[PDB]
């Protein structure tokens, strides 16, 4: 029975950037508390917290209500931190582990720069844009994530059509040109896999969007990583 716990916690590991107050293994109550609105009192105890851990502790396919509530909370909090990223992959990686989903494959704990899926590369692009906005202005009031995450994790053209014109000015506002060049290099390397911007993203692709977003975000929070990758340009 411990094999289910092992197969649940080996994938539970995420990227986790530097100086992050989140532990390596997120507490399961605190891990599922990211699906609630605020406090752990008024949630959804049935197809969610009353079945997620059921499918977890038995190596079973996670419910789709998990993905639904995770997308709802990503639309609510407008940012997915260490709580839903370590839980959205639980549905897709387990579905591919048993064979039931579509053509996508499993996931890892790091930032995979391949995959060639139409939803993961969009999340990577969105996280790159978010970090570009963060580096352009150290302080503000609400990130472009807090402004777009409502529907950007689903509609590529509907928001990125009015968003890809913002990172040029963001890189212009950067006081260091090398940082802008490295951000351009990484966004080009990412979008090289994106074949085209579809009309929407399927339910099986929005989770990949959020996972790639969290991956690229916590990867760009590293002390030295983007420069090391840009050294081989």
């Amino acid at each position: 029975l411990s094999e289910s716990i092992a197969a649940w916690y080996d994938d539970l590991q995420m990227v986790r950037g530097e100086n992050s107050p989140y532990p390596e293994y997120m507490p399961l109550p605190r891990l599922l508390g990211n699906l609630v609105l605020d406090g752990k009192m008024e949630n959804l105890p049935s197809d969610l917290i009353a079945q997620i851990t059921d499918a977890a502790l038995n190596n079973r396919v996670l419910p789709v209500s998990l993905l639904q509530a995770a997308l709802r909370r990503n639309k609510a909090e407008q940012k997915i931190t260490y709580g839903r990223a370590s839980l959205l992959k639980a549905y897709i990686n387990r579905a591919i582990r048993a064979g039931r989903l579509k053509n996508m494959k499993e996931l890892t704990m790091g930032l995979d720069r391949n995959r060639q899926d139409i939803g993961y590369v969009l999340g990577r692009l969105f996280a790159v844009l978010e970090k570009i906005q963060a580096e352009a202005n150290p302080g503000l009031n609400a990130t472009i994530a807090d402004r777009y995450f409502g529907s950007a994790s689903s509609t590529p053209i509907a928001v990125f059509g009015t968003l890809m014109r913002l990172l040029p000015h963001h890189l212009n506002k950067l006081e260091f040109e090398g940082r802008a060049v490295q951000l351009q290099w990484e966004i080009r390397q990412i979008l090289e896999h994106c074949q085209r911007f579809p009309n929407h993203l399927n339910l099986e692709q929005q989770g990949l969007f959020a996972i790639g977003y969290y991956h690229e975000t916590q990867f760009l929070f590293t002390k030295d990583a983007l420069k090391n990758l840009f050294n081989e340009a």
Binding site: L1, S2, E3, S4, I5, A6, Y9, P23, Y25, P27, L28, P29, L32, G33, V36, K40, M41, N43, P45, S46, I49, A50, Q51, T53, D54, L57, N58, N59, R60
Partner: protein
């Protein structure tokens, strides 16, 4: 195998000696404990709380099994030695008079019949004369820490005699035999079989016991009431042919599992877990040690047995987890 596996697990944990109920007892959390001497005389109002961040209702003690009150004329139940705060001193901060005095009358009648049915003990006589003295019960309210048991409701009160200071009035080797016989001879003269989880005889356990820990109130696990909850007109309780020697066991197992180290809720649902010991799972119950270390390994000793992730509501217990793997 809802209560069958639970009964098998209780038959494993009971014969292991690790603080568990038996025959007709239950591990209840008694807040303030009243200590007296040999003949009434209230001499101490001790409290054994201060545990977690919230002042719980004292430590756990093996008291007689609760008969299950919750009703209009609830004083007609009259438990053995442990009950409410209106059954000892006839006090009522929000319950009111009349309704609380009859509770004290029923409780003193119960202790008097227990004394006349079991004399020569130096234990039941003290609690029997304490309620028929009419001079120490009023002194109980004028104790040292009595102003604290009134701000918190649901304060259970127990009795502890002198020359012990470790065993309650319902712990000496005397009333234990009476309680064991109550669930062996008195609680066995009813409807015949057949049982539901053991397949043997056993009387039909009418009015199932209440499980404390899931909800704020002692919420019964499986209990049929109202009217439409009947199969063939069994009328409250007889719908499930469950025996006493199994219903009591599963209720006490859920009570012990809802107050120990295995009691932890992920969110509006208490997902208690256990093992077969042939427990030492250290997997599902190890979700709250200190700072979440790495105890997951592979020693080829993964015990079987499922886990019951039940949730409260109003006063019933809803089952949602069912997976042997």
């Amino acid at each position: 195998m809802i209560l069958h596996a639970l009964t098998q697990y209780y038959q494993r944990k009971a014969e292991s000696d690790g603080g568990i109920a038996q025959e007709g007892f239950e591990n209840k959390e008694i807040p303030f404990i009243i200590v007296i001497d040999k003949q009434g005389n209230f001499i101490q109002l001790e409290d054994t709380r201060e545990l977690k961040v919230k002042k719980k209702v004292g430590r756990t003690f093996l008291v007689p099994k609760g008969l299950g009150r919750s009703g209009s004329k609830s004083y007609e139940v009259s438990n053995l030695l442990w009950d409410h705060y209106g059954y000892v001193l006839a006090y009522a901060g929000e319950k009111g008079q009349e309704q609380a005095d009859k509770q004290h009358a029923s409780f003193t009648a119960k202790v008097n019949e227990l004394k006349q049915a079991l004399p020569d003990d130096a234990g039941v006589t003290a609690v029997a004369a304490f309620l028929s003295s009419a001079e120490e019960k009023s002194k109980v309210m004028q104790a040292a820490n009595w102003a604290e048991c009134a701000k918190v409701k649901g304060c259970n009160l127990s009795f502890r005699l002198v020359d012990e200071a470790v065993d309650l009035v319902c712990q000496s080797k005397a009333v234990r035999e009476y309680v064991s016989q109550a669930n062996q001879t008195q609680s066995d003269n009813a409807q015949k079989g057949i049982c539901l989880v053991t397949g043997k005889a056993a009387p039909i356990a009418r009015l199932h016991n209440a499980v404390k820990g899931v909800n704020a109130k002692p919420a019964p696990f499986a209990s049929v009431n109202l009217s439409a909850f009947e199969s063939y007109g069994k009328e409250q309780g007889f719908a499930f042919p469950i025996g006493e020697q199994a219903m009591f066991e599963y209720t006490t197992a859920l009570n012990t599992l809802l107050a120990g180290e295995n009691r932890f809720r992920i969110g509006d649902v208490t997902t208690v877990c256990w093992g077969a010991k042939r427990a030492h799972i250290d997997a599902v119950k190890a979700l709250y040690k200190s700072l979440y270390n790495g105890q997951y390994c592979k020693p080829d000793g993964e015990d079987k047995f499922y886990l019951l992730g039940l949730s409260p509501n109003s006063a019933r217990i809803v089952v949602r987890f069912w997976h042997e793997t």
